[model samples]
Target: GSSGSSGILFIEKPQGGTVKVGEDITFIAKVKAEDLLRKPTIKWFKGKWMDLASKAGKHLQLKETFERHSRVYTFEMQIIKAKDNFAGNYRCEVTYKDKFDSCSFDLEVHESTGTTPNIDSGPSSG
Candidate 1:
């Protein structure tokens, strides 16, 4: 069946992808709903299905906002100075009343080519 048939909850955002070392990786989850008083709950999970916001730090910046103009809530999770070990699965869960929906992202981090690449390899190597 199609999602959002009742127009109660919707998960509109991005999935996971690859990035280079020292680069930043971000996941944005936008949830739409009505009735400001009856808002929903948003949560982000990593490999082990634990709440990311609980242990969030400077390296892991978490931002949430209720945009009145769009009638949507934004959940932005950004990883600063991404490293190779940061490669994993990230899940975003949105719950309203008794219904819930989620989106997952797979992040693969590769080593950067470095600031100054090796490009002075000329002939004449006698």
Candidate 2:
């Protein structure tokens, strides 16, 4: 039987971790689909699937809101300024010709550490 292509997807950092309530934590990933004839498109969703923002037809960026500036084969997002209410699970769903793939990550931001928090050493509150 002549059939179309069936593909597979893999995710890194599937086991989520913890981060402090400080600004400037970056989220990044790369997704590829096995179908040779169809180009893969990855769209991320904090709630709704939205395309990341684009700049000068180059590297993508997100404007403060888990949004990104995007391209054909790359995906990037930034969590700006950081806040607790914004903490939770996030998902990325990829779409190509006839294939579908998706992945998710958990982000639990804790209450700020007393006496300021450090990203490198983490929680001087010890």
Candidate 3:
């Protein structure tokens, strides 16, 4: 009376932080299962699963390297030189043996406070 199916697993980061333009931000996705044979493959997307890092037939490997007897897999989404355009909902989809799972998070990018000029000024220096 058991089905070999996978379900959506909630994924999240340890903590949230704000990033500035031209900065790099890395996103970590953690997945959990409840009666699955193989680990799910992770895919990154904007609104939909557009980009497929690994194909359906191909098995996902940790750090892009395959090894025997590897159960848990970890993937990293690196935003090289983050920009305003990168601020949005990023989705992560995982596919197991015959099931699929997914999760998403919002990435908030604000102007660099470190580079912001001081606005406090005394009387106009004439």
Candidate 4:
């Protein structure tokens, strides 16, 4: 066998973490695939592969960018205003022919603390 083919591979995977309400939450997944003739299908899902089209452009933003030189595709999903109920499982799937790649995120949203700074007492070195 010669230098063979590579299926859809994740170059940069999205990470999940806690975010405050009224803030923004984003997930970015960058993948590399050699499907020159056929393009891959990029999709973002919330909670068990539910199509995200219902909330498109309301509070959700989806973006995709492809680099021709490197053949890398970047998929980004952003929630404009985060909410406590938004804390759930998220998944991104990229399908190309029989091979496909998927990434998941477990999002946690917390209430946004008021804009107050509690400055503690400074240490004095006498």
lDDT of 3 by residue, 1-126 (tens): 683534434333323345677776666665544433455666676535445243222221223222233334456666655667666666666776655566657777787667557778678655
Better of 1 and 3 by lDDT: 1
Candidate 2 wrong stretches, greater than 4 Å: 1-7, 11-15, 33-39, 47-72, 114-126
Best by TM-score: 4
Which numbered prediction scores highest in lDDT against the true structure? 4
TM-score of 2: 0.51
Model 3 misplaced regions, further than 4 Å: 1-17, 32-39, 47-70, 113-116, 120-126
* C-alpha lDDT of all candidate models, in order: 0.75, 0.52, 0.54, 0.76
Candidate 3 vs. true structure, TM-score = 0.57
Would you list the rank order by lDDT, best first?
Answer: 4, 1, 3, 2
TM-score of each: 0.74, 0.51, 0.57, 0.75
The all-Cα superposition gives candidate 2 an RMSD in Å to the true structure of 9.9
Residue pair clashes in candidate 4: none
Better of 3 and 4 by lDDT: 4
Off by over 4 Å in 1: 1-8, 49-51, 115-126
Per-residue lDDT tens digits for candidate 1, residues 11-107, read 5765788888988888778886666777778777777855677757866777788987877788788888777667787777788764677777788
Candidate 3 lDDT at 69 equals 38
